[PDB]
């Protein structure tokens, strides 16, 4: 589905933009309908639940009694929902805005942390905006300069920070959006060091055993007289075995 949005820098760099998705987790669409045996029709199930405050001999109540209570400190605090629907966070609209930049490419691989990747492509339809965006990525190409971009799908989704990697390829010049952690979603914890460890250092014949295992189990070597790499077993082209 064609995604129309609008990128901004500062006051007014309003680039009309197209976004599309890319690699993501695949899910199977059909569901297991629970039927009853010996009839082969569905309608013989009418599930119920009762919000039964027993805590005693059993008292079974109707719906209209339920306050959504939260937990605080050592107790339960009331006030269910229309008040939280009022005093929630106002999300003020979607955005594909730019927060800042960094010449130092210091967003590294072990912090990406989303479940999708978003190819933000270009404009369409009188593509002065798209040639401006290709100029932007053709400025971001020459050095390792990264771009921190703030996203929202809609009013519903929480806003998020992410990195916009540039993508300089043959028939397409695109940018790809990945997510980023907020500072509740990290944790650092001390693990023991293995270089200056006076107990668990190996031997060199053990090291060469490892190297023989590697060079006999290697899958990527250069050949075909121009020494570009050929890889055995490329683990990307497999069809999915689960739905098969």
């Amino acid at each position: 589905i064609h995604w129309p949005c609008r990128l901004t820098i500062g006051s007014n760099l309003s680039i009309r933009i197209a976004a599309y998705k890319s690699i993501l987790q695949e899910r199977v669409k059909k569901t297991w309908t629970v039927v009853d045996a010996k009839t082969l029709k569905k309608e013989d199930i009418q599930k119920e639940t009762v919000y039964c405050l027993n805590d005693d001999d059993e008292t079974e109540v109707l719906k209209e009694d339920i306050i959504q209570g939260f937990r605080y400190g050592s107790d339960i605090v009331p006030f269910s929902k229309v008040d939280e629907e009022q005093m929630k966070y106002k999300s003020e609209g979607k955005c594909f805005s730019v927060l800042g930049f960094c010449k130092s490419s210091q967003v590294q691989r072990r912090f990406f942390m989303g479940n999708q990747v978003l190819k933000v492509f270009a404009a369409r339809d009188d593509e002065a905006a798209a040639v401006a965006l290709s100029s932007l990525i053709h400025a971001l190409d020459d050095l390792d300069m990264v771009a921190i971009v703030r996203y929202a799908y809609d009013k519903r989704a929480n806003p998020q920070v992410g990195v916009a990697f540039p993508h300089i390829k043959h028939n397409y010049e695109c940018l790809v959006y990945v997510q980023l952690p907020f500072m509740e979603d990290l944790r650092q914890y001390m693990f023991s060091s293995l270089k200056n460890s006076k107990k668990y250092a190996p031997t060199e014949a053990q090291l060469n055993a490892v190297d023989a295992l590697i060079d006999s189990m290697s899958l990527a070597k250069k050949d075909e007289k121009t020494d570009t790499l050929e890889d055995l077993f490329p683990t990307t082209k497999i069809p999915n075995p689960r739905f098969q």
Binding site: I23, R110, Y200, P241
Partner: protein, 490 residues
């Protein structure tokens, strides 16, 4: 230990001039200490909500303690951070609180000596649990409190030494009687100013540590190694919404059943089957059948080749990335094989390729193990631990197809302008501090019910752009970058 808890005793010196305004109409140190104590409680009641937190004022006129001394008043006891404790304690704010503390306990006396540390030791000794941290937060401003009697000084340093012996440590958070840190006095005998940690910096965090899976990597068929698969970036979110009865103010304890088979009655797990429809024909199966059709292998990691770190593009990712470490429940030496494998995989820049089945019945999944060497420094900047790291890899219908058949070239009159623009906007990244607006305002909004002060409290969000400070910082080249080559011109 894993189920270990920490402990903190707030010892307040409200004696002579700390209860005075210091003849200064600028700030009052009693209200400053009670504000700092309220900030500590009001953060750790959602940050780390299981430690032990006590409040004890000394130098008071009355006394309340289980050895029955004088001038020493314990107020609360070692327990959780509680809404009752903070709603009780905030009655000592301001001059109204100064007068209420005056009439409630009074102020000013010849305060204690070693005996208050004796009260702290008899407060810690009662607790039958596993104390891991033993700290005392002292809020005082005088720095020679017994500067006329040396016997009390010698007995106080003796009793502080015997509190240091058993494992109690105090950090006196200095109030500002001279404002600047000019009291370069001789208080080195007891100890092991800056208040900003106690003030602001931790409104939405948590503390936890688990291991999430303990699996084994098999190389050929017989060479097995044991690895704990830790998780290090976890996506915290808001707690579950407990259900509650209206009148009696209690949980509801729901229950669930299934009936009405065109007869009514009541059912069991066995009478009903699973099913699907595909256009015209219907399939029926059992629950074990639909749970056994996704059954491949056994839990663990399976070595399926090797590759150096050049084919994988970081265009390719699917989920967060875990972190595998050499645990100690196979043999004393799996650490050594992992250390050798670490050294060789790092120096020849090669990365492992494996199949990975997470638990007892899940389809298998291809991962790639990338090594990581630790980084520490002089002052122990332990930023990385040494060990291996998973990266996931997609299969088939992950990668979709774009429209993608568009390729237009621009003109190189914009690249220097954009280089100047991105050098104008350049800031060195971050280390922390990009906190969550939704969870943050939910924390504040829940503060404003059981603490019910006025309204939703402060709700700044450090993820908005500031266009007003962007325009002047950039300058008037927005128009020339907008229309140097290209007019929209409607």
């Amino acid at each position: 230990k894993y189920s270990g808890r920490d402990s903190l005793i707030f010892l307040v010196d409200a004696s002579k001039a700390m209860f005075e305004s210091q003849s200064e109409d600028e700030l009052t140190p009693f209200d400053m200490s009670i504000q700092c104590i309220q900030s500590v409680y009001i953060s750790k009641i959602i940050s780390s909500d299981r430690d032990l937190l006590a409040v004890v004022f000394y130098g008071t006129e009355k006394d309340k303690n289980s050895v029955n001394f004088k001038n020493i008043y314990v107020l609360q006891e070692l327990d959780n951070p509680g809404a009752k404790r903070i709603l009780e304690l905030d009655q000592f704010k301001g001059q109204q609180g100064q007068k209420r503390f005056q009439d409630m306990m009074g102020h000013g006396s010849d305060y204690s000596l070693s005996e208050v540390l004796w009260v702290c030791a008899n407060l810690f000794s009662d607790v039958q649990f596993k104390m891991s941290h033993k700290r005392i937060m002292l809020f005082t401003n005088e720095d020679n409190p017994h500067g006329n009697d040396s016997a009390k000084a010698s007995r106080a340093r003796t009793k502080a030494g015997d509190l240091r012996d058993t494992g109690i440590f105090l950090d006196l958070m200095h109030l500002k009687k001279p404002g600047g840190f000019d009291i370069s006095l001789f208080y080195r005998d007891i100890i092991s100013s800056k208040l900003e940690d106690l003030l602001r910096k931790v409104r939405a965090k948590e503390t936890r540590k688990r291991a999430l899976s303990r699996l084994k990597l098999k190389l050929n068929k017989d060479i097995v190694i044991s690895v704990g698969i830790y998780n290090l970036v976890q996506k915290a979110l808001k707690p579950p919404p407990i259900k509650l009865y209206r009148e009696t103010n209690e949980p509801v304890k729901t229950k669930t059943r299934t009936f009405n088979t065109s007869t009514g009655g009541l059912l069991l797990p066995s009478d009903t089957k699973r099913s699907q429809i595909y256009g015209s024909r219907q399939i029926i199966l059992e629950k074990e059948e639909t749970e056994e059709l996704k059954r491949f292998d056994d839990p663990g990691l399976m070595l399926m080749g090797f590759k150096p770190l050049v084919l994988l593009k970081k265009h390719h990712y699917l989920r967060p990335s875990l972190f595998v470490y050499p645990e100690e429940s196979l043999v004393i030496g799996s650490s050594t094989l992992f250390s050798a494998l670490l050294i060789k995989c790092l120096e020849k820049e090669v990365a492992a390729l494996c199949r990975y089945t997470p638990r007892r019945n899940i389809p298998p999944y291809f991962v790639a193990l990338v090594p990581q060497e630790e980084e520490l420094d002089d002052q122990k900047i332990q930023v990385t631990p040494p060990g291996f790291q998973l990266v996931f890899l997609p299969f088939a219908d992950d990668k979709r197809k774009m429209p993608f058949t568009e390729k237009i070239m621009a003109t190189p009159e914009q690249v220097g302008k954009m280089k100047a623009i991105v050098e104008k906007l350049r800031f060195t990244y971050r280390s922390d501090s990009f906190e969550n607006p939704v969870l943050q305002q939910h924390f504040r909004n829940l503060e404003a019910l059981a603490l019910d002060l006025m309204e939703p409290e402060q709700a700044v969000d450090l993820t908005l752009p500031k266009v007003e400070a962007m325009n002047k910082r950039l300058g008037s080249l927005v128009d020339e970058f907008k229309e140097l080559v290209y007019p929209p011109d409607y």
